Design a protein around this ligand. Structure first.
Ligand SMILES: *C(=O)CSCCNC(=O)CCNC(=O)[C@H](O)C(C)(C)COP(=O)(O)OP(=O)(O)OC[C@H]1O[C@@H](n2cnc3c(N)ncnc32)[C@H](O)[C@@H]1OP(=O)(O)O
Ligand SMILES: [N]
Lengths: 5, 202
């Protein structure tokens, strides 16, 4: 879930 | 010669984003009928989904994930997540039990990440009642197939360290690696971040 750095 | 490199990469992403049905050639992946399920799977751009389907997908994500987002550095904000899920570039795999009840989905994109063409899995979400039946693994295998068929270099995703079931699913059952972009791959004294970025090369 989501798009982290 | 730096624009030439990103132009070959962006060309492949732009082409994938112009596809009609990325699964047209792969009808065997449009059904999952194991362990009591009878699911039909479709791949559509978000523009092709009914609004009530987008609402179901957002609500399922919030139900499953809100607390874990608040336990992370990110926080949860409805508007930010809804905007991400309804971006024109969003693609969806939707699993419909008996071709009628939505029970699982993935939000994915064809994009560039760290100079590489990737298929980025922004969500994989199942209703509780359909879990531990192999459906999640199958959806990720579809993503892997689409990454291959569009000439992406990897499938990528983010997982919370405190999402222990999903972490074991990706790392052990599906053998995703920790990606070089993950926070844990910078620093030699064991930095402290609540997520990992995982990937699987094509
Ligand atoms: C961002 O989206 C990436 S991180 C995923 C975030 N989503 C999330 O947390 C939503 C809630 N969870 C799910 O929707 C679902 O639990 C998944 C998507 C995490 C996994 O889907 P499935 O339930 O369909 O998993 P299977 O394909 O049946 O599992 C295959 C094998 O993986 C291991 N597995 C899966 N869940 C596990 C949990 N909770 N704990 C330990 N291990 C898990 C098993 O090895 C499993 O095989 P089994 O034969 O043991 O069932
Ligand atoms: N990252």
């Amino acid at each position: 879930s989501g798009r982290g750095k | 010669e730096e624009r030439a490199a990103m132009d070959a990469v962006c060309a492949k992403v732009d082409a994938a984003n112009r596809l009609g049905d990325p699964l047209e050639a792969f009808p065997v992946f449009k059904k999952y009928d194991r362990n009591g399920l009878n699911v039909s799977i479709e791949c559509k751009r978000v523009s092709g989904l009914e609004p009530a389907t987008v609402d179901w997908a957002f609500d399922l994500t919030k139900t499953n994930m809100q607390t874990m987002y608040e336990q992370s550095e990110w926080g949860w904000k409805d508007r930010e997540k809804r905007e991400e899920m309804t971006d024109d570039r969003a693609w969806y795999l939707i699993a419909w039990e008996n071709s009628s009840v939505p029970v699982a989905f993935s939000h994915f994109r064809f994009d560039v990440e760290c100079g590489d063409e990737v298929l980025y899995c922004y969500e994989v979400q199942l209703e509780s009642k359909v879990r531990r039946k192999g459906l999640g693994k199958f959806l990720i295998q579809i993503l892997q197939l689409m990454a291959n068929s569009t000439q992406m270099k990897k499938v990528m995703l983010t997982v919370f360290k405190h999402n222990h079931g999903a972490y074991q699913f990706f790392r052990e059952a599906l053998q995703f690696e920790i990606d070089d972009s993950s926070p844990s791959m910078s620093g030699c004294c064991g930095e402290d971040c609540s997520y990992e970025i995982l990937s699987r090369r094509t």
